[model samples]
Target: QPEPDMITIFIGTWNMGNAPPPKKITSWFLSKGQGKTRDDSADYIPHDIYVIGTQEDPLSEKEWLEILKHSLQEITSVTFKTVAIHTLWNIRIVVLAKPEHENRISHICTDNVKTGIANTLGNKGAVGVSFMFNGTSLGFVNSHLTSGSEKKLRRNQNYMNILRFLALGDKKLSPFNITHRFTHLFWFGDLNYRVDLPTWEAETIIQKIKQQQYADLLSHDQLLTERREQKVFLHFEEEEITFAPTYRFERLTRDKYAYTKQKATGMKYNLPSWCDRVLWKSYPLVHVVCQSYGSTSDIMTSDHSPVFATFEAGVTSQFVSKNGPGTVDSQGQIEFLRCYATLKTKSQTKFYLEFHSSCLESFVKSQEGENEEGSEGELVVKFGETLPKLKPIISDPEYLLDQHILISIKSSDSDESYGEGCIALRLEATETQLPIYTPLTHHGELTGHFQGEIKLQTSQ
Candidate 1:
């Protein structure tokens, strides 16, 4: 069995009530004292990945996304690069990860399902973002199901529509049953699964909540009952609620549960329920462990308080990947050098580029790290077989730095050469990565382009 890559993931969901993000959400995203003070507390750990989902955002997608990007930066030491961001009508979902996992993750795709009002608007739908990280696939769905305390069945059908209609990823154009399809799937947002206590008196329902009899109150919760009866959310898991209900708060008030919104006749009051939630289901390799599951109370930017959770998600091993060449030996580190080729042709002829691996090995040994300018060489042909479109990712990617790789273009129908050029490894290094992106050339003239990146793995 392959060893798992253990990582910590933080997923949060908030219904913004069509309000823009507060200037300082730093306290909400992660708790106070992040730097050294955070290090003092043993339980408060940093998350490797963050999936933040919001509903009814008031600002434009660009402005809304900007607030999210910077809010995360103020909390963690590691830089979080966005993997994917997608918004559907009032719902938006963003996924971000550390720079170290840049090359390991690929094939990012986004999709949406509109289950809004009358099934025509995007007001009550879901948005999804899926990606492959460290050889394991994960999907995220942020949905705003039907509202109203009595609309439990409506919310159940909305969940079904999200699962039945969402087509994720670019490789396949089919409905992705996310609950079963992905190695792991995270679902969140304003799920609106309210409590349905069996009392004709709404006043006594508040009394049940006021008396702090949460155990009996939660016993009649729709989400729990529906899932318990196998009517919805099959195989999903939600952490036990150690905190108060997250819904029906008096808008712009601090921790005040408004049993009544307005004092007018025929006016409806707040149903103190856990409306916002985060739930997840993943294939068993190593079980996901929740470090903390709770909501933040300081920010009263909207009617609903934000709910978040921190979990330890173990990524399954890179089991003999079928996309590229060679099986990974059981070494502590596996580095890969991936190369892509683009050839310009007048009639779009059938041609491919090739690279020589043996020559690559010898060149890396003799010239690597010796020159700031790296080694630039001739267009070596006559000695390669593998096509460039196969995107040969060679071993010992550490040597790929500053080493210029050259490929020869050849025709598929005929053995005639269409000339050769140097595929320069021009891109430079960052704190976590040393990716390469070079010039387009053919015998020292601009014609086509070639670029690639090196994925170096460490045991850290």
Candidate 2:
């Protein structure tokens, strides 16, 4: 078996829908990389090559090859190849021709024999390209996933379908179960999951791996830190290679208006996210590095920028540590965390509303009764001792809370003037749930804005 002298993989999500030749604001190109190319925008210099999207871009075979040729003409060391799902308007997934080898190399596209899922396209649901590096026999699966909510759900289903198909349907399944393949298999592409919440992520996909104990190249737990945006490596061994942060947002010329300005300000191009990532089954890379690691300027081409990393087969070890299944909390634990987080948000909301209503009710009742009916043997004060002081009411123990569920049903207050009102009042005992935590701050007071209208009609 001939070994690859050098092997590197590039991942990029290019929105070539804006292409001069093949323009469609809706489509994107997801293909693999092969060779070098010159860039008109970056000054005719040879630039590193990258594969585009898997199921979006709409260029044909000859056209796609031409694209690969044009893009890599300047880069001298690398080659380019394109593979996509050949989707219809970024929906369906179908296999395009696999990668072709010109040098002492070859690549193929194979997966679990079973169909992907019950999606519009079942077995044809996955869009990917895999190539074997000569001597090392390392393979690569580069692809993309559907994005929208409805579509993403389907993608997830199909994704799992592939996993089941691999384990059950494939003719020659793995000896070490799914461990070795998932460990050595370098699967790179746009998974399309922007999970800012770590626990949610585990519940979604990491749980599946636990059931099968698939060993990813790196153990993500040790990699996660307080450092905001840092590369997380696949610590199969004790390697010090940093993961790449691909893609950035570059405001285009059309974004001159305030709307675009807001977009530019709120949108982050430099934020490091693993939207486009690289994975491996074996240690085929050394000194994993990325050029233009994160740039805001690439927004001109696509929402995501390209990432490149070079590799040497059986290179000196960086002591890559294997982040095993033990590090991850059980799926049940993660789900509990998710549920707790959601309930916390809800309780905070309810507390504010209850608190507001109490204040307003007290105000209307106090002012009306204070006038004293006068006439003859009439009550001096109509309502209770002036609506309880704003400061004191909030301090009441029943309304305030030490943890959550602060609302205590001490009494209900409703008057004809107030019209069928009076529900329990809830107050916040802690300052943690300030306006900063809740979106309701943008409006008027957190609660009780409508109480002033409660008619106080004085007696005639």
Candidate 3:
């Protein structure tokens, strides 16, 4: 049995030379203290790691690691991992670790996950961490892609290169770890890509991964609940607010040094698009909840707000099918039919209670969510007695057997019951074979001023 584990990984581009003021970083902490914290704040409170620095400072990296050690020690038994991928003179990687099983944790490996652009060529600048647990091995890779030039082209190459480097190292797994059959591999960092841009190789990467069965849990449309922090620096348009820089071009007038916007002004950039992504080749093994996080100290700690993500390797062994039907099978079909039938009957009741019910009098309401006003007064009936509306919706008889019953109802306009409303119903024939004179379904647009005489009630 594979043990279960969960991890959170963070990524950021910090500019040590131009770090923010300590007061600013402290303010962030106060904000978190006020309950305005990120997603992982609940379990991973008292943040455990901080990644800061420009690639140039091996010494500065050491100081940041020391600061991280203190930030993490507040937690009881868990451990932490830190490394500086000294690739370009301005890039670095910092990692925080949590082991599924403490006794199993021993040593960790770190390396950059990139072959830094031109000036820094011939170097395998990727940072990785390896550890073993539950009779299986696992690892994590943290990196920042070399960003510049030919927008689409660069990202495409980076996407392919990243996966390959993270998995095969120098394009090949080692002798002892042959095949790099890691139970789980977490690959997350500043990919610097956009979700809506179709020109990039995102589709190819996504399609290939899905075809290969890797899951990218996050999607563009889904309002991800995990992101608790909003991007603070980006201003769409207004006065020129000389925003603080993550990396200063220089301290001079516009003629000598000025910060140009990344793009056009009217074209907004505030949707919290995560240029940083968290990817995993295997499931539950590197079980993790991805989220957004930052600290006030992080301002002066580094230029860019460090994206906080935690990593716990050798997690429990449970596979959550990324994309499958609602359940293992249609085994719940019968139960579904029963609940669905009862709810279908109550649909109109729900509508009336929600839209028609007096603001204060609807408190004891049980029918609002599932209301369905019938053609006649709210034809409230016992479950079995309710009608199934969409029956014999014929075009072909073959598909009829699989049809589910539905009902429609409406509201009225007069004052007996305040002309409360009514419902048009469609009842289903339980006999499978209808008698000559039997009515199989019903439907109609109901109105206000209805006299609903049906007794509304419920069963245990």
Candidate 4:
């Protein structure tokens, strides 16, 4: 049996507080500590996947996305591709993975919840991305919870909201959605839970962090307290955090704790807390082992220091076949032609499809048949449960190798029923009524109900 494909992943969370973009993103994204306390000896390893979440980020989503892509390309051996990028108010979350595994990643979806005002504002919420990785579905959620010592209950509720509110597609919503669908989950962000100690007591505890005697302080962390009590993040596990508290840093002073700033201003001083965190959960088919977890000391752009976790994900070896994984099937050599699709009307049902018919010809090996068809043969196609029915427009079910065909689709249901749907097309045998192979799936949204010419998009 083949060994499981082990991939390293790095997850980082920061509350930027709407700060300006850093002049050195590599310092924040790749390198570790800087300044006088820099640890030059710590080895820097490039991860196969990177998930960075920011709270109070004010930068343009597209511009920052390009910068991240460029930065990763400059550093990594293989070019990385954006798995998903989502921004809600000041909270932005991005997922990037190596291009080598692009086929293994699919069904990308995101959803957010507003837990700020009356549980309907954007100041506090979470952004989540769910995808099938090497045939094993996984989810990553970046969240900014309600902040303050007195709102620990609200912070926990925010976690519940993220767990329950999910977007299956652009306009399709589901409840308690991600709790079980994914084989693994990575949850991280400025959870905003604080220590139970008073401001002065917490400040004193901060001093021991540098001395590596931080366990005593962690025992009093409110998030940890709740986790132990099985009140929040019930079964999720985090690496043993040996680092200092990641919150309440001074704006100008990089080394000093910021708790005293509010104390000196006669305002209520918030206790130094490990408000940012990274946590994960794995199902029976998946395994995750944390290699490292800590906070970076270099970037002071955010009041809350960024926290990261390095881990290895072990997915089931059997999930992916020898022919390559995900939706790309061996037979028909079929695949989705586009990254995304949008539909404006139900009547607009034409779809452009491409496939290598040589693979399809090899699939119809029969003892009684004359081998005269060559690259041409009958090909049956069908879409997933939620999508429309597909029929070849030319009416000839036979196909030629490396051919482009126009397929007509009939709407599965009225537009009023659902705002979004997932379309997964498959190849099947007509005689035995058995599925031969599957490929070509995409998430689409219902934009409007217009009565005009059908609009179509295709990619080479």
Candidate 5:
């Protein structure tokens, strides 16, 4: 079952240019590289998922992976587990997920392609990772396409090839085409797309950037141009680029273009552009809301600043809560850790909820209700063929906050229920209360009255 809150994911892309990996890499992963805060907070919150892409890393795969692992593990509060790692020449991609989500992540696979030598060599290409997250398939690809402004066709073809590339050893293990295999996908890297503008005009836009008039310059971005022309990127979409161009920086400086060409020489250099990019695609029902998108300028080691994007996936809560804080112990204290009994299920199977003495005590504590010695309670769940009796696992108030009683529904038949029989909660030793029938409601419709498939099952 999905959680009530949407899961946050942080995705970043950088072209390292084979420079030494920075020591404090966590700042980049946590915040947007540097000179920024996660909202107004100085400390960034740990995300549920992390996807990182890099190009032109000089270190071996093992060394870089170890460096990344060390940086991520430094944060003691959150545990990040490895999901997938793929490398093709200088292009590399890595995915890390939180430990709590380990059981829900599976079917890990990777694919890579070499589209270099102007489509002949393997010097440049894309590496992708595909996996299932919380029953939803997802794909992340890190690519380095053909460089140069005139090779827009080459860049477009590389994307198509990357999408078609197979990753898993077994054909059924992963999707044949990434677009068809995953419900949501993110493609990011140093795409190397250039601006289609004259040298004088391009330099003018770069200067006007200080005046906040770069929109006209970005209007001529090759990627956006091709996207409008329907040359590629079928359903993929890129967030609006509000930041300045990320590429062609004068080494060691945040501003100014590097290696400018003179128009009088009858030759033109590629105009500074937002070559580094992050784009995403998703199926219907899997809505992706972008929170932030931009490049970081703190890392002056590389001419191309790293681009970072934060997003949240819309998901439905698997567990439902019913009834208010009506059930209490002898002292008028909330009687259960989670007083109301909840039916839990995933696609109509597998469910459980919090039970036990600790649950009751925690419930009391949660409600600002003191736990007296005689304040005890029991939950009698009457659903399906048998009526199961439930009680607190631990009665000690100190330990009650840590422990919970777990009830699992074993019977497969009649697993569906719609407020059928009352599930009652009462102070077993002091007082017994009446059974409560909590009706499940979604969009104001009763559970059993749904037009489509909706089932409810019991769990402790």
Candidate 6:
């Protein structure tokens, strides 16, 4: 049986160049190997999730959606619903998941960042989508960075702009900055990073693309070079390229290699580059296994070939609980590290809560009254319904054998406290969950619950 905590995801990205898409788009996602004239699909890998991001997509939003819907329907019997679809003009991101996963997913949100002319146009930029699936946060993004060769610096800025401005969902739960917030993140589209060689030398090697003349081409791949220098995409990983570049194809060419022309410049043989890409980030204690990677075949309507990847990503809890505390340990106790504390109110009241632990010097910020006025410290954005989990840094286990945790709800914009409580901690011993009650000093009353235990810390 498939691991209950594992899910298969397929991600595809293409720069369709604002035209009509081909009717036979399945070849861009599915494999048809060793078939009679490459028209059969007997052996195929199935995916639980399909996330397709396109830059300068061929059709308008509604028309594009219909084509994708029709194409999907022709492929499989299992119905896949459009889970989340977001667009920044021609730049778009669409997610399709099986119907069974409808309830397992929630908090569907999206955000876009445009780095086009004056940073306002949609010609260049990204559309981001985030959602919680089976208790795992998944982030999907697609963009078309600034075009033209020799614009690596511009591309770098574009990347940072997307991360800094594309805020989605809520309360930092799905922010792009926190790889920790997302269990898995997939970034893809026409990134537009080029091969360092000039058009002349690039064409020489381009002709030998089928002969595996990629060493020289890949050595100067601007994206890889920047990654090697730690200038961008920190810690993100990509599958080794085993195919030719995916860009600058002559329009309407079938399984062929040719360059395109610009309306103003006449014939412009842009260097073939792996402008379209699919990359992912892996988190601590969570692994991402890439199953398929490469450009698509038989779909040559666009000037850029579509790139794709399939991954089996990790999962934490299996329920979509915005109010969940965190992953649980054996015996049904809350996981000690990175545990969340929620402060809920029964009635409509406005007050922010702060989390403090004796072992740590930092405070976890709350969403209550945060947007109005608050410090930019680390956040656990939630109301009484959800709080980010506070974490403790430790070197020696023996030191934390006994630590105190204080969950305090403060008056709005004041030091005065409305109510507060603590979870007694004895890391060296086991304890059943003990309820907590903190009387509202100025307001009324509130009831809370927390479970605490630390063990094997004596080291004696």
Better of 1 and 5 by lDDT: 1
TM-score (C-alpha) between model 5 and the true structure = 0.63
Question: Model 5 — which ten-residue stretch has the worst lDDT?
Answer: 449-458
lDDT of 6 by residue, 162-266 (tens): 866777534422111433235577888899998888666755866667676788889989999999886777657998877678887777873565554567434
lDDT of 2 by residue, 1-460 (tens): 4333333443444333233232222111212121122123533222222434433445665565565544454333234444333343332222222144333333444443223335544323333333333322233344454442223344445444443333311123211122122213444455443433343343333343234332331234222221122222212222232332232233242122111224643442222234454444352222333222221222344445443332323311111112212232111100000000011011111111122221122221122222223345322222222232322222323222210111111112321111111221122212222111111111111211112111111111
lDDT scores for all predictions?
Answer: 0.62, 0.29, 0.32, 0.58, 0.59, 0.63
Please give the lDDT score at residue 372 for candidate 5: 21
lDDT of 5 by residue, 173-271 (tens): 221245544556788998888877876676587776667666787778899988888676755788787777887776567767673655632354757
Model 1 scores a TM of 0.64
What's the TM for model 4?
A: 0.64
Instruction: Report residue 2 deviation for candidate 5 (angstroms).
Output: 7.3
| Cα RMSD, each candidate | 17.2, 24.9, 21.2, 14.9, 16.0, 12.0
Off by over 4 Å in 2: 1-6, 15-55, 77-103, 110-125, 146-159, 164-184, 195-274, 283-296, 299-301, 307-310, 315-460
- Candidate that beats the other on lDDT, 2 or 3, i.e. the better one: 3
Better of 3 and 5 by TM-score: 5
TM-scores of the models, in the order given? 0.64, 0.38, 0.40, 0.64, 0.63, 0.68
User: Against the true structure, candidate 5 has what lDDT?
Assistant: 0.59
**What value of lDDT does candidate 2 attain over all alpha carbons?**
0.29
Q: What is the RMSD, in Å, between candidate 2 and the native fold over all Cα?
A: 24.9
TM-score of 3: 0.40
Q: Residues 1-460, candidate 1, lDDT per residue (tens digit)? A: 3343688777888898777666777665673221111123533345778888888777777786677777776666556788988988878898888777777788788999988565446479899999877656688899999887777888888888887778774333111245544657889989998778643555676666566567877887889998888778766798886656777777777446665546541365556788888889765333578766667766677777787877778664443323223533222222224444454544344555444231132212111111111124323122121222212233333322222343444555563434333432323332244444434433223444445454433222
Name the lDDT value of residue 357 in candidate 2: 23
The per-candidate count of clashes, in order, stands at 0, 51, 73, 0, 12, 6
Most accurate candidate by lDDT: 6
